[PDB]
Amino acid sequence: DYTLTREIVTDPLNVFMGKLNDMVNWGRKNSIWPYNFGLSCCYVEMVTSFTAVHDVARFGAEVLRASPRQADLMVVAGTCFTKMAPVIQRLYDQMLEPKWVISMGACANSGGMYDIYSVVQGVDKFIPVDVYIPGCPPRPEAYMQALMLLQESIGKERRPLSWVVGDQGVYRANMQSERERKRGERIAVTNLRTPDEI
Amino acid sequence: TDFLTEAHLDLPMEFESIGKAGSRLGTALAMAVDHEINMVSLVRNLEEFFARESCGWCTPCRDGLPWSVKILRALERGEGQPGDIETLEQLCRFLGPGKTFCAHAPGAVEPLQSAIKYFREEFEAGIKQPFSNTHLINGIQPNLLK
Ligand code: SF4
Numbered sequence: 001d002y003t004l005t006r007e008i009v010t011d012p013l014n015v016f017m018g019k020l021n022d023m024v025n026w027g028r029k030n031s032i033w034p035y036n037f038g039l040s041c042c043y044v045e046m047v048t049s050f051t052a053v054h055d056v057a058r059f060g061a062e063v064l065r066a067s068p069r070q071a072d073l074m075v076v077a078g079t080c081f082t083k084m085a086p087v088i089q090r091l092y093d094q095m096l097e098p099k100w101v102i103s104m105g106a107c108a109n110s111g112g113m114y115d116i117y118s119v120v121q122g123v124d125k126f127i128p129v130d131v132y133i134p135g136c137p138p139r140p141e142a143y144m145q146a147l148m149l150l151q152e153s154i155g156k157e158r159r160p161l162s163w164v165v166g167d168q169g170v171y172r173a174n175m176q177s178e179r180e181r182k183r184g185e186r187i188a189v190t191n192l193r194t195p196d197e198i
Numbered sequence: 199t200d201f202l203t204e205a206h207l208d209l210p211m212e213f214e215s216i217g218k219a220g221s222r223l224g225t226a227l228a229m230a231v232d233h234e235i236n237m238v239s240l241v242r243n244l245e246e247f248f249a250r251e252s253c254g255w256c257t258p259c260r261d262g263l264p265w266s267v268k269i270l271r272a273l274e275r276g277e278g279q280p281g282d283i284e285t286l287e288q289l290c291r292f293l294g295p296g297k298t299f300c301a302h303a304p305g306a307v308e309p310l311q312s313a314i315k316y317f318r319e320e321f322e323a324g325i326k327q328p329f330s331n332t333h334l335i336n337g338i339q340p341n342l343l344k
């Protein structure tokens with residue numbers, strides 16, 4: 001299943017054009033350049049993922065950019081304060097297509113624990129989000145897991161190959177939810193280690 | 199009425215003479231206890247009578263006499279634990295006149311406090327196991343109080 005933007009449609013995908021679109025998607029998913037944007041504590045765990053003990057550079061996603069023009073992925077890692085929300089909107093608008101969004105942490109997801117007068121309740125109030133990470137903060141390996149989820153989402157999407165030839169619509173795969181995918185193994189868990197030991 | 203020892207046999211059976219000795223004249227129908235009677239068992243029997251003859255109106259008698267009964271049963275069986283005699287002493291203190299609705303519970307706690315005062319060695323002999331109110335729950339480390 002797919003979602004159309006320019007509507008729920010089917011898969012539009014010649015055998016050379018499909019392979020070369022797959023190569024485009026493979027190159028996009030193996031070359032993701034995140035934007036350097038520090039909001040709150042979630043950014044500290046994000047740059048912890050950038051460091052040597054985790055080495056997110058292995059996935060090719062270490063190239064941190066101070067310019068939104070050269071960044072493909074925006075990781076909203078922190079609280080969306082009301083004064084910072086126009087800044088986040090302007091930085092998102094300054095990015096170029098294709099652009100992806102990962103909300104990191106409960107603040108970016110929904111507002112989290114700050115249902116307060118000066119906090120926007122989630123970055124999806126004004127910016128579309130492709131991957132959400134729960135946690136406060138999510139650990140760096142959770143950020144890496146969200147990165148892999150973003151790569152699976154990117155590798156299954158259909159984008160305009162050129163602005164002069166072909167359909168210019170953007171197709172996003174309506175993937176299965178991770179909750180329903182992992183419900184088979186999560187419910188079967190019986191015994192966990194007791195909290196008294198290490 | 200409070201227990202009295204052999205040395206108290208010489209004072210006259212009057213209200214103020216027995217009252218100054220730490221007991222009550224009562225009905226003046228005395229009862230003798232020989233050396234073959236365990237004082238813990240005797241006070242257990244007395245408190246079983248008093249706890250089962252509570253009318254149930256007021257909290258200290260109704261809910262404190264059975265606790266003393268259970269403590270005395272544990273002491274008679276040799277299953278007493280530390281703090282039990284302290285609990286009995288506090289029960290005698292808090293079931294006195296004015297604390298309960300009528301005078302049944304002060305009369306109940308007179309023999310217990312007198313026997314603890316005069317025959318404490320028999321009550322301490324019943325304490326033979328450490329205090330244990332909780333069982334261990336797997337996965338929860340207990341708060342180890344000192
Ligand atoms: S979700 Fe928690 S850790 Fe992340 S920015 Fe909010 S308060 Fe900080």
Ligand code: SF4
Nearest residue numbers: 253254255256259300
């Ligand atoms: S002290 Fe008297 S009023 Fe209170 S429960 Fe006992 S018998 Fe009843």
